[PDB]
């Protein structure tokens, strides 16, 4: 009946696995054994941003590395001026259960969504001057886990219904749908060249998609539990993963396999956010133990800890310029580090 | 020189209005209480929703003694709830509604309660436990055509606690059955409570009009206990 299909499907997995093993020429540690350590990074909390009433679930930076958007589960999406610590806008949300936020590269729009299953796009440069909704993207049958802009008219989204979608804001409807995840997709990171983007789901895997074609290029596995964070290596040829198994791993698109694992025996809590530095040498990972650690991305050496939060760290972000790192936590405060 | 300071003072003026609005919104926000109404599809959640409303999130707002309650029912999700349940860490309590007549689903309900109670992020939130459809349970028990021992062998070795206060006219069989159902959940809760949170069991029907009063009463004690723990009185 289906014996041939089953046999071929089972054998193809080993076909891929053997090629991966053969390509496994040498572990990254053996190539990075002699290279100097970063040292110890004594990053200090420079600013603390207060005004959110409840847990902060998402935070994102603008292209200019000054303006900062953050979404709290009290129904507010504040835009902070990081240099001055002042606020610019306070967008009241129709639903209190926001779970993600994004800053359009142009800065004219800001996005948010959550258990409402609707991705709402806001306009911060209206003719009247007051922040107001611009579109309410609907079509996902699950909570919106992450959303990022490719440009002012396209936003890529991830939903708890195990699908990722690409929207056209003016049209207000999907254009290409990404299917293949087995569990809830929890995060996505658009490529620096915005041609590809990778998303991690609650199935112990991350997948590489093509924004234009919509096909699945590569599925990455190796984690043991749900993946909660994803971040592209700045070069665009690798990406880091955060998961509930208390480890972070670095995957390479061309090699098609894990290149390094970042773990410690005293860490038994999950990773909630992952973000590289500008040069890619420093990997910053937030944890449920209220601590954000700094991993040397080439030697898997913990070079520092950003201990300043009560309650879990929710979101992590590095300025495009690289002059600061933003940390949001369920303590309802945002802290800027450098 | 003039332009820079003009812009900076304008930004400060805008931030002042933002702060004022946030202050008023904090007043409103902390004035209300937030509840996560949770339970199986066959549980009579709709009956409770109607009972409040007489006064894909089906938010429900009701008011008792000038205290504003806000009740949420997340119905637009899949069955894998382990990720969106974390959004409700701040809720005052979880309203767990249970069908006490469906013995097949009782173990599923107990497992869900066990997971909610011990979850790393929800193990600070008290649970108001509503054992719904008690008239159906009574009819099924006096009917005799179904036995609870087949699904819970421990029933043959259970006797009602002295504190049980059966309503007038109840057969001993029905009170024993319902108090066993209650005691399963109480066992789960007392196994690892650690005094951080408590479960408040109640019985109710589809034609009961006092569920909002019960939620108000239970929330009062939940907040009272949290405050006393905050001030080190315990």
């Amino acid at each position: 009946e289906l014996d041939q299909l089953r046999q071929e499907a089972e054998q193809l997995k080993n076909q891929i696995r053997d090629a991966r093993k053969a390509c496994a020429d040498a572990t990254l540690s053996q190539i990075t054994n002699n290279i100097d350590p970063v040292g110890r990074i004594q990053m200090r909390t420079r600013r603390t941003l207060r005004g959110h009433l409840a847990k902060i679930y998402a935070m994102h930076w603008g292209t200019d590395s000054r303006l900062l958007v953050s979404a709290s589960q009290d129904g507010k999406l504040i835009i902070w001026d990081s240099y001055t610590t002042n606020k610019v806008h306070a967008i009241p949300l129709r639903s209190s259960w926001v779970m993600t936020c994004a800053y359009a590269p142009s800065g004219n729009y800001v996005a948010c969504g959550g258990l409402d299953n609707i991705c709402s796009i806001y306009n911060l440069k209206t003719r009247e001057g007051n922040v107001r909704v611009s579109r309410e993207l609907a079509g996902h049958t699950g909570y919106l886990s992450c959303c990022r802009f490719l440009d002012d008219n396209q936003i890529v989204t991830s939903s708890g219904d195990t699908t990722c979608a690409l929207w056209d804001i003016e049209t207000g409807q999907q254009t290409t749908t990404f299917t293949g995840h087995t569990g809830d997709v929890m995060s996505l990171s658009l490529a620096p060249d915005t041609r590809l983007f990778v998303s991690g789901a609650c199935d112990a895997s991350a997948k590489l998609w093509d924004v234009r074609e919509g096909m699945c290029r590569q599925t990455f596995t190796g984690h043991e539990s749900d993946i909660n964070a994803i971040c592209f290596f700045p070069n665009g040829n690798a990406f880091a993963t955060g998961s509930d198994d208390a480890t972070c791993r670095l995957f390479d698109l061309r090699a098609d396999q894990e290149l390094m694992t970042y773990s410690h025996d005293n860490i038994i809590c999950g990773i909630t956010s992952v973000s590289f530095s500008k040069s890619g040498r420093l990997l910053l990972a937030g944890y449920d133990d209220f601590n954000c650690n700094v991993w040397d991305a080439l030697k898997a050496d913990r070079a520092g800890v950003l201990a300043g939060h009560d309650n879990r760290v929710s979101c992590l972000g590095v300025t495009d310029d690289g002059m600061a790192v933003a940390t949001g936590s369920w303590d309802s405060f945002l802290k800027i580090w450098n | 020189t003039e332009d820079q300071r003009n812009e900076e003072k304008a930004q400060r003026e805008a931030n002042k209005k933002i702060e004022k609005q946030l202050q008023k919104d904090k007043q409103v926000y902390r004035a209300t209480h937030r509840l996560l109404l949770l339970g199986a599809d066959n549980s009579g959640k709709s009956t409770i929703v109607k009972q409040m409303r007489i006064l894909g999130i089906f938010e429900t707002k009701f008011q008792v003694d000038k205290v504003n309650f806000h009740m949420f029912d997340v119905g637009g999700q899949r069955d894998e709830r382990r990720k969106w349940i974390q959004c409700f860490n701040d809720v005052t309590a979880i309203i767990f509604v249970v069908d006490s007549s469906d013995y097949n689903r009782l173990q599923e309900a107990l497992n869900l309660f066990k997971s909610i109670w011990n979850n790393r992020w929800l193990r600070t939130i008290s649970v108001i436990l509503f054992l719904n459809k008690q008239d159906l349970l009574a009819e099924k028990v006096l009917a005799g055509k179904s036995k609870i021992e087949d699904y819970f062998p421990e029933f043959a070795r259970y006797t009602t606690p002295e504190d049980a206060t059966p309503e007038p006219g109840e057969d001993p069989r029905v009170t024993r059955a319902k108090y066993f159902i209650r005691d399963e959940f109480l066992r789960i809760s007392t196994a690892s409570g650690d005094g951080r949170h408590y479960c408040y069991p109640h019985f109710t029907c589809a034609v009961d009009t006092e569920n909002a009063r019960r939620i108000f009463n239970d929330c009062k004690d939940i907040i009272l206990q949290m405050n006393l723990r905050e001030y080190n009185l315990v």
Partner: nanobody
Amino acid sequence: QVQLQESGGGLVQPGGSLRLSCAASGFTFSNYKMNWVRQAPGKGLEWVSDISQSGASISYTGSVKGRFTISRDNAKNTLYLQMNSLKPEDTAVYYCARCPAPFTRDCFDVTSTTYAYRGQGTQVTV
């Protein structure tokens, strides 16, 4: 990959006994609470029993207590379910399931739809 594969099952005369074996590979078996879940024909998923990390904590659904007994061997990353005196109502597809995250007492894994950390399943016929 996080691979769970079940073994055992098959036709059994009413009564008798069987032994289900789930081989866990790709993840640290010692670190996870593990469960058995059943889906009878024409019925939804049901949770059978669970065993904690060490084996010092155990629980069963009442309908099988005294008939089944779970066991695990951490050193060989294998989980066992020994079934005795199978009633005809016990015929169902049995899956070995792993709780989603390590070092926790909570699990959300009896899903009508797909769930990631669970084997293909074995059918037991009485």
